[PDB]
Design an enzyme around this catalytic site. Structure first.
Site, PDB file in Angstrom:
ATOM      1  N   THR A  13       0.789  -1.063   0.055  1.00  0.00           N
ATOM      2  CA  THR A  13      -0.083   0.095  -0.143  1.00  0.00           C
ATOM      3  C   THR A  13       0.732   1.192  -0.106  1.00  0.00           C
ATOM      4  OG1 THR A  13      -1.760   1.256   1.033  1.00  0.00           O
ATOM      5  CG2 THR A  13      -0.207   0.230   2.338  1.00  0.00           C
ATOM      6  N   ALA A  37      -6.959  -1.834   6.753  1.00  0.00           N
ATOM      7  CA  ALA A  37      -8.000  -1.307   5.786  1.00  0.00           C
ATOM      8  C   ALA A  37      -9.476  -1.043   6.554  1.00  0.00           C
ATOM      9  CB  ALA A  37      -8.138  -2.156   4.384  1.00  0.00           C
TER      10      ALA A  37
END
EC number: 3.4.25.1
Lengths: 254, 227, 212, 85, 199, 239, 197, 237, 204
Positions: free
Chosen positions: E1, E49
């Site tokens: 990410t 997340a």
């Protein structure tokens, strides 16, 4: 919906709190107490309702208590409510000392106790504390201070004031003959003596019928001392001499 | 009688109905629902010229698609409005959609009789939730009793009776939002204690489209000129 | 004492312009024991929504029952059925409710959105979700999703028409990928249950699968 | 509301009121009131006019009378007790 | 990410990749790492997340409540403080948040960075995620305050392209958003393979 | 755990106990408040301050924050409670959002507290009315009045207390842009409003003022006397 | 991790702090300000665990401001330091302990300047000069060698400077910018940051 | 009378609780509803009332589960709270045991709940009466719950204002009940409501709600145009 | 160790109607030094001192709690705390939270307010009040302090001699402790004086 509630903390048809004012007039019936400020120190006199002959003297005071190093109070009204309030005052002062590492200011302690008073006058169904306090203290912000707090939770700072029996007459006399930027402890004691005389006219101010406590500063420390019987007798004798002299002068003029 | 939860011999909580009496003491709010949207026009009782009229907040935004016109006691109104806003936002957060006007009105009403001995007395406020949802514009009236019902046109407040009689005389199902605002302002002017001057009334509209919109002084002046 | 046991199970969701396919292997393992070859992982939440749950079977059962209870509660409160997006959001909140003791269950909701076209939402055990065109969860997710990317997504192909996938073509792809998954993975086998959500309703088809 | 409007009409029949009356406005302005309250409102409107040395009582006089009889005297009202009784 | 954000005198430009990786396996190449808190706030996703999404959704709820309660928009600093307080309440329990909150307020463009351990700090050029270091490198060497809108677009896009190229767990798309006074707009979301071919 | 309904509706729909709280307010010393171009003035009747009473400990005007001040009318103990709670809330707001409170925000908080006390169990209403005067970050004078019932409005000029009605009508008249052009003129308006009810000026008056975002400043008795003297000059010039 | 330093003088309590905030191997803020103005004549420098520093410093700041607003007074430096120590000690053996190291500088009209040291365990130490952080190990030696009670304002500024160049020379972390302030009778004055580009 | 009717914990000298009687009076003032049961069905028919003629008639039939519905008469808020309680209990039963909650036990739970705030000081009876129409493995069921917490298992019943006329009609036609199709059952319910209605008014789609449950038929509520088919066959008085 | 975190060394002894309480002066955390004027002998009365030693945070916390309790006690009883009553109060304070204690070891040294009889006692972190007639030691280097005290102290001894003995013992003990020292504060309490001294020490 209770039949036994008695609705302690309600308002009245007019915005007048019956329990608080009944407590106020209980204060009025209670014994007299007064306090005088002065540039050198503060003093607090108090009539004694324990003048019985078979009554022992075990404490250093009965109307007057010490809250912390540089602060004392005097109670008028109900003795037991006064005892609990003084214990709470000591707790508040020592909590402030534990928290900030310095003595609680007089106005701050008065505000804390008056917050408790207001809590009792607004919350719950418990009757208010029928006790009026006269605080005399010293702190590094405004020096010698005198405060007077009522059952309603209202406090005011005074230069000279009185609570209890004939308090209205005592405060009127102090208003008449109190000097603002003057009147050191000597004249303050004389004024307190004469006020107590004209407030307890029934009795000619026997030294055993009153208690005086003086708060002053010495070498950076605060000393709160209850005037001994010797000193109280000396003060009463001086006032009697002055009163006799004034009467003689008036008669000679006439 | 003694106690907030006592029933009358006729069948009556005594406190819901004293709350209704309290409602009959408030300013007059009028809500209309039409196929083109929902209008909410509320009298704004200005007691002195020194009172900032803009600070009298009787029409509020529950959400982008729901407004509320309050009458009776404005502080209780504000409490209920805060609860309604929190509930709408909670529903959006959980379900990622918009509260229906019916759902939000019932969620608010379920808080109307939650007093005992929490609240100690009922809410002395009557609310008009005018919103637009999946099934078009809807106006719901709620009263201190917690009984909500969706009306084609409702008038709460001190002038409720006369305002609703006039709403009967004028309102028809196949009307436009512009004429709904027109008629609402006519009725509000008729029942007004003073002259309608565009600063002593709040007007709001929720349409199938643009979000809840509170008419500005310019639009209010235009409509008032039209009447 | 470990409160989680991986019971196995492969689920798959394929979106479409007017349909949503949700397939699941009826196998239900206990590490090395087959136990039931029945008991699929597809649950018919509403007329326009199916949910596939894989992983720990106790959590699967409890979560499905909680979903059904919440759907009935929403229906009672709002006098209206529950949309696929609303179900997805509500179940994301439900999963995150037990954030620090998660439902060890991978979820995939396949249904019809309010516009009437297919919609697929893929969750994680903690409650992170996103609308997707297709997704495989469970033991053979790695063994299924790349082929969906190749065929349904038309990825890694040049000069290839992007014709939309039909219902029949999608069913054939689901069946082929699940034959392969049962062939290679050991947690997949026994039989395959396919739930097809379409405007008319929901159709269920079961197909034989490798038993070993 | 209708009864209060009718009572206002009855008590203002013989008065020297001006053109526009709005007794319906007065009735809505003084709810949960009694006929005694209403007659006192009419009388106080007349006395306000007399005090101003006018021979016509106006809507402003009537509103002042309502403020005096319904609002200021609200603390002496018997209805809040005798409705329970 | 990998995600980044920076203020460039015309607004706050925020870009992010799209890859959720479960260990050595990538769940999806189409994650929306820059989640739209509301028309005036963009919250970036890094780390957990689910934690990021849920808590920034709760922040969107709280900000809407604030805007309804006070007839005014919530400042970017106010929103960042709200998020920091909410996360710090559950401090050390497991949350793995990483976020840039970007918006427009009365104090010009606003950009703040927060995470699970209450690192609410302002700034002008922030980057989070595994590829945050590579994004920092490229963005720092290509960033200036007096940057044109298109220049900022190119800078963010190429910095994240380099982040995907280096970091394995930070691939996918190049989702790009611009935050201006009127609100925010999704400038473009182009894949990484096409960017590689372009470069 | 008293749990008793103190405030309940009367048969005619009135909350008689919040009405009694409002009566407690009306029997308190008058407090006037006006807002001008760049100054908010806030005067109050000292109400018979004894020669022996330290005027510092009577605080009918209290600063809730650097940009918000509160004039009181009612029961002093409730004054202290509400003021302290408002100060705590203002500091909490400074915490949560890195901006100073707005006068509207603090007024709303006080109103919410008053409503909570008017419809909570075993709690009588705060028998006080408050005038919140201050400036927002944008630099706009603001004046709000809050009643015991939790209703708060934004005003251009209030007077709450014994002479509330007379002072309110006086302010309704002779209050205009010309009369509030200058800070001195605004202070003149407030002092005249107070004089309209307080029989003796100067002694029975205490003014506080707030210029644009500078600080709260309590006008000394000499300054009050000077303002009163030139007001007398203006009056005798008129007559 | 970060660095704080404080040099007390006859009538000033000069302080300085690093301006670097970092996570992992990368610093993401070059102008981080670690000074919290408790009051007009009290300054607080907070370091330690992320989030805990800001939370505790802001809570102490708003409590001190609340004290000021309630009383009209202003908490003395000693009273504020003891309030902070009591709060930190109470939080120490609790579910939410603050891992914050503090320097509370201040000026009192009567007592004068005051510099306090206190670690994440609530332990006050009124000191003439103090330092926090791994750079404190290098810098306190120079402070103790070159510090005198009668050190003037300019001399103290120069001492802090040369101390910071020593920190650059020896300490490994990149600390190029330091924010410098002085609390004296006239309040808090911000000096030009001691930068080493 | 006056001193024995302020609290629910006060027994009148005649062994009566006037607060319970007053709650029952509130239920009586509630609008009219008639429940009635057959061999394989159970029907609630409620005469909705409009507070204002611009206002939609208040709904009176509420779902409780796939096999239970309730017709409410009395305080709407209390009705809604009881409805929430029944919904929660049915959901809990369907959660623990994968089965529908028997109505005979749901009504017992309601009775216990509504009795709890009848012994305690400062609490009041739920000012709402319910006609619970449900279906379980033992066929259909019609129950009548009242604020006193005493619940009756009725072959047919009527509650609300002017419900005694419906009671007389049901007394007359119990024999016809239990052996008639669903359409005839609904017609009987509508006839009872018409009997309650004044001679000036008559049933209409805007005025009638019909909840129907039975074997292989989950509780369905018909209102507005959905009620017209049941009124078409209905004759005139 | 927890005590070794901050060090500390405080002891006391007695003679003819006069006691002494001595403590080290340092606050350093671990090896590093912070200040050399840390107070750890607090006066709980006119002729009564307490020498809390150990963790600095616990030293100050216990001193402040004890002063709070003692002020409450002395105000509620117009009276001065007796040394034995103070020992009981400190034991109760320490033992009130066994399960997680204050990591300080008080040593109380004072004179009976009425008879002015010497008194010394020490308590452990759990509140083990031991009252002796020769010594009390607490903090680090309790072992060196015990050695010096045993091998240097003469019973029934006068004020100056007692000051010299306690000073020598503390100096040598801290010098052999290292982790404590850097200045020794000694208080000699007599019938009519309190003599405080700030003796030398190896500042290292």
């Amino acid at each position: 919906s209770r039949r036994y509630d008695s609705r302690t903390t309600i308002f009245s048809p007019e915005g007048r709190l019956y329990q608080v004012e009944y407590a106020m007039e209980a204060i009025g019936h209670a014994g007299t107490c007064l306090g005088i400020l002065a540039n050198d120190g503060v003093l607090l006199a108090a009539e004694r309702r324990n003048i019985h002959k078979l009554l022992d003297e075990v404490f250093f005071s009965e109307k007057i208590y010490k809250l912390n190093e540089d602060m004392a109070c005097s109670v008028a009204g109900i003795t037991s409510d006064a005892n609990v309030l003084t214990n709470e005052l000591r707790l508040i002062a020592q909590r402030y000392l534990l928290q900030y590492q310095e003595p609680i200011p007089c106005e701050q302690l008065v505000t804390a106790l008056c917050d408790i008073k207001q809590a009792y006058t607004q919350f719950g169904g418990k009757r208010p504390f029928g006790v009026s306090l006269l605080y005399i203290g010293w702190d590094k912000h405004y020096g010698f201070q005198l405060y007077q707090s009522d059952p309603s939770g209202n406090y005011g700072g005074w230069k000279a004031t009185c609570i209890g029996n004939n308090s209205a007459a005592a405060v009127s006399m102090l208003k008449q003959d109190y000097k603002e930027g003057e009147m050191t402890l000597k004249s303050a004691l004389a004024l307190a003596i004469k006020v107590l005389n004209k407030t307890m006219d029934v009795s000619k101010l026997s030294a055993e019928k009153v208690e005086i406590a003086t708060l002053t500063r010495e070498n950076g420390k605060t000393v709160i001392r209850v005037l001994k019987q010797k000193e109280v007798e000396q003060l009463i004798k001086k006032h009697e001499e002055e009163e006799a002299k004034a009467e003689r002068e008036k008669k000679e003029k006439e | 009688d003694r106690g907030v939860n006592t029933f009358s011999p006729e069948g009556r909580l005594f406190q819901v109905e004293y709350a209704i009496e309290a409602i009959k003491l408030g300013s007059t709010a009028i809500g209309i629902q039409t196929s083109e949207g929902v209008c909410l026009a509320v009298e704004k009782r200005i007691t002195s010229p020194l009172m900032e009229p803009s600070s009298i907040e009787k029409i509020v935004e529950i959400d982008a698609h729901i407004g509320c016109a309050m009458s009776g006691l404005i502080a209780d109104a504000k409490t209920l409005i805060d609860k309604a806003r929190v509930e709408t936002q909670n529903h959006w957060f959980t379900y990622n959609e918009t509260m229906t006007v019916e759902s939000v009105t019932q969620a608010v009403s379920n808080l109307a009789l939650q007093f005992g001995e929490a609240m100690s007395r009922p809410f002395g406020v009557a609310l008009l939730f005018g919103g637009v949802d999946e099934k078009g514009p809807q106006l719901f009236h709620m009263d201190p009793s917690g009984t909500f019902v969706q009306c084609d046109a409702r008038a709460i407040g001190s002038a409720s009776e006369g305002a609703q009689s006039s709403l009967q005389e004028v309102y028809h199902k196949s009307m436009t939002l512009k004429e709904a605002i027109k008629s609402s302002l006519i009725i509000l002017k008729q029942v007004m204690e003073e002259k309608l001057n565009a600063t002593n009334i709040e007007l709001a509209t929720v349409q199938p489209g643009q979000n809840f919109h509170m008419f500005t002084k310019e639009e209010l002046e235009e409509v008032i000129k039209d009447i | 004492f470990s409160p989680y046991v991986f019971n196995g199970g492969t689920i798959l969701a394929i979106a479409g312009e007017d349909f949503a396919i949700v397939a699941s292997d009826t196998r239900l393992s206990e590490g090395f024991s087959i136990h039931t070859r029945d008991s699929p992982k597809c649950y018919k939440l509403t007329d326009k929504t199916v949910i596939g749950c894989s992983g720990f079977h106790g959590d699967c059962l409890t979560l499905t029952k909680i979903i059904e209870a919440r759907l009935k509660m929403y229906k009672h409160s709002n006098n209206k059925a529950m949309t696929t997006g609303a179900i997805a959001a509500m179940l994301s909140t439900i999963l995150y409710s037990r954030r620090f003791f998660p439902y060890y269950v991978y979820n995939i909701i396949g249904g019809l959105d309010e516009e009437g076209k297919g919609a697929v939402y893929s969750f994680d055990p903690v409650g992170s979700y996103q609308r997707d065109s297709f997704k495989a969860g469970g033991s053979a997710s790695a063994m299924l999703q790349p082929l969906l990317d190749n065929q349904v997504g038309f990825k890694n192909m040049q000069n290839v028409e992007h014709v939309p996938l039909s219902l029949d073509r999608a069913m054939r792809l689901v069946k082929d990928v699940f034959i392969s998954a049962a062939e290679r993975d050991v947690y997949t086998g026994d039989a395959l249950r396919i739930c097809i959500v379409t405007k008319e309703g929901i159709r269920e088809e079961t197909v034989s699968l490798r038993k070993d | 509301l209708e009864g209060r409007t009718h009572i206002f009409k009855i008590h203002a029949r013989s008065m020297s009121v001006e053109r526009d009356i709005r007794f319906e406005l007065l009735a809505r302005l003084c709810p949960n009131s009694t006929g005694a309250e209403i007659r006192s409102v009419c009388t106080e409107a007349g006395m306000f006019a007399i005090r101003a040395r006018r021979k016509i009582a106006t809507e402003k006089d009537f509103l002042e009378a309502v403020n005096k009889v319904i609002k200021s005297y609200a603390k002496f009202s018997a209805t809040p007790r005798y409705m329970t009784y | 990410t990998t995600t980044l954000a920076f203020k460039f005198r015309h607004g706050v430009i925020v870009a992010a990749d799209s890859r959720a990786t479960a260990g050595a396996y990538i769940a999806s190449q189409t994650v929306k790492k820059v989640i739209e808190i509301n028309p005036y706030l963009l919250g970036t996703m890094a780390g957990g997340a689910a934690d990021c999404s849920f808590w920034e959704r709760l922040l969107a709820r709280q900000c809407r409540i604030y805007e309804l309660r006070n007839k005014e928009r919530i400042s970017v600093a106010a929103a960042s403080k709200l998020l920091a307080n909410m996360v710090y309440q559950y401090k050390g329990m497991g949350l793995s948040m990483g976020t840039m909150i970007c918006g427009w307020d009365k104090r010009g463009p606003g950009l703040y960075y927060v995470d699970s351990e209450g690192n609410r700090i302002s700034g002008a050029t922030f980057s989070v995620g595994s590829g945050s270091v590579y994004a920092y490198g490229v963005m720092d060497r290509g960033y200036s305050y007096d940057l044109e809108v298109e220049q900022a677009y190119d800078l963010a896009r190429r910095a994240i392209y380099q982040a995907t190229y280096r970091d394995a767990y930070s691939g996918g798309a190049v989702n790009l958003y611009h935050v201006r006074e009127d609100g925010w707009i999704r400038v473009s979301s182009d894949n990484v393979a096409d960017l590689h071919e372009k470069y | 755990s008293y749990d008793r309904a103190i405030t309940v509706f009367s048969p005619d729909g009135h909350l008689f106990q919040v009405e009694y709280a409002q009566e407690a307010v009306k029997k308190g010393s008058t407090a006037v408040g006006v807002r001008g171009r760049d100054i908010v003035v806030l005067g109050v009747e000292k109400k018979s301050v004894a020669k022996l009473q330290d005027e510092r400990t009577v605080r009918k005007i209290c600063a809730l924050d650097d940009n918000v001040c509160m004039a009181f009318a009612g029961l002093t103990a409730d004054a202290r409670i509400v003021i302290n709670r408002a100060r705590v809330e203002c500091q909490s707001h400074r915490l949560t959002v890195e901006d100073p409170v707005t006068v509207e925000y603090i007024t709303r908080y006080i109103a919410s507290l008053k409503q909570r006390y008017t419809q909570s169990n075993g709690r009588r209403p705060f028998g006080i009315s408050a005038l919140i005067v201050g400036f927002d970050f944008d630099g706009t004078p603001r004046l709000y009045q809050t009643d015991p019932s939790g209703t708060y409005h934004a005003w251009k000029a209030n007077a709450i207390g014994r002479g509330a009605k007379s002072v309110r009508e006086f302010l309704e008249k002779n209050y205009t842009d010309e009369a509030i052009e200058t800070d001195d003129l605004t202070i003149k308006l407030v002092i005249k409003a107070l004089l309209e009810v307080v029989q003796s000026g100067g002694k029975n008056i205490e003014l506080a003022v707030m210029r644009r975002d500078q600080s709260l400043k309590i006008l000394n008795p000499e300054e009050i006397e000077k303002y009163v003297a030139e007001i007398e000059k203006e009056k005798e010039e008129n007559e | 991790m970060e660095y704080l330093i404080g040099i007390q003088g006859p009538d000033y309590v000069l302080v300085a702090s690093d301006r670097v905030a970092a996570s992992n191997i990368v610093q993401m803020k070059d102008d981080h300000d670690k000074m919290f103005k408790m009051s007009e004549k009290i300054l607080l420098l907070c370091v330690g665990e992320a989030g805990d520093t800001v939370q505790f410093a802001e809570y102490i700041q708003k409590n001190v401001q609340l004290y000021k607003m309630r009383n009209g007074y202003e908490l003395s430096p000693t009273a504020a330091a003891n309030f902070t120590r009591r709060n930190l000690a109470d939080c120490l053996r609790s579910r939410t302990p603050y891992h914050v190291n503090l320097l509370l500088a201040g000026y009192d009209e009567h007592e004068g300047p005051a510099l306090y040291y206190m670690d994440y365990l609530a332990a006050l130490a009124k000191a003439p000069f103090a330092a926090h952080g791994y750079g404190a190990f290098l810098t306190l030696s120079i402070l103790d060698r070159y510090y005198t009670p009668t050190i003037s304002r300019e001399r103290a500024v120069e001492l802090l400077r040369k101390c910071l160049e020593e920190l650059q020379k020896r300490f490994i972390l990149n600390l190029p910018t330091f924010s410098v302030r002085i609390i004296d009778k006239n309040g808090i004055h911000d000096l030009d940051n001691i930068s080493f580009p | 009378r006056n001193q024995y009717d302020n609290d629910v914990t006060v027994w009148s000298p005649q062994g009566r609780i006037h607060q319970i009687e007053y709650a029952m009076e509130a239920v009586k003032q509630g609008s009219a509803t008639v429940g009635l049961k057959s061999k394989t069905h159970a029907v609630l028919v409620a005469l909705k009332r409009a507070q204002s003629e611009l206002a939609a008639h208040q709904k009176k039939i509420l779902h409780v589960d796939n096999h239970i519905g309730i017709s409410i008469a009395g305080l709407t808020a209390d009705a809604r709270l009881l409805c929430n309680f029944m919904r929660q209990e049915c959901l809990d039963s369907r959660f623990v045991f994968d089965r529908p909650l028997p109505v005979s036990r749901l009504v017992s739970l309601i009775g216990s709940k509504t009795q709890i705030p009848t012994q305690r000081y400062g609490r009041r009876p739920y000012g709402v009466g319910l006609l619970i129409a449900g279906y379980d493995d033992m066929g259909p069921h019609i129950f009548q719950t009242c604020p006193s917490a005493n619940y009756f298992d009725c072959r047919a019943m009527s509650i609300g204002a002017r419900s005694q006329s419906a009671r007389t009609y049901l007394e007359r036609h119990m024999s016809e009940f239990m052996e008639c199709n669903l359409n005839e059952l609904v017609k009987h319910g509508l006839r009872a409501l018409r009997e309650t209605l004044p001679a000036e008014q008559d049933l209409t789609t805007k005025n009638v709600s019909i909840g129907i449950v039975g074997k292989d038929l989950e509780f369905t509520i018909y209102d507005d145009d959905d009620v017209s088919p049941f009124l078409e066959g209905l004759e005139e008085r | 160790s927890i005590m070794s975190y901050n060090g500390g060394a405080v002891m006391a002894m007695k003679g003819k109607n006069c006691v002494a309480i001595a403590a080290d002066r340092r606050f350093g955390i671990q090896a590093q030094m912070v200040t050399t004027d840390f107070q750890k002998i607090f006066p709980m009365g006119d002729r009564l001192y307490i020498g809390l030693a150990g963790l600095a945070t616990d030293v100050q916390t216990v001193a402040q709690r004890l002063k709070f309790r003692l002020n409450l006690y002395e105000l509620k009883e117009g009276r001065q705390i007796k040394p034995y009553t103070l020992m009981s109060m400190v034991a109760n304070l320490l033992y009130e939270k066994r399960f997680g204690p204050y990591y300080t070891e008080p040593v109380i040294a004072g004179l009976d307010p009425k008879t002015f009889k010497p008194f010394i006692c020490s308590l452990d972190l759990i509140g083990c009040p031991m009252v002796t007639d020769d010594f009390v030691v607490s903090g680090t280097c309790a072992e060196q302090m015990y050695g010096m005290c045993e091998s240097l102290w003469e019973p029934n001894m006068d004020p100056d001699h007692l000051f010299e003995t306690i000073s020598q013992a503390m100096l040598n003990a801290v010098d052999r402790d290292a982790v404590s020292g850097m200045g020794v504060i000694v208080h000699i309490i007599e019938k009519d004086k309190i003599t405080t001294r700030t003796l030398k020490a190896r500042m290292d």
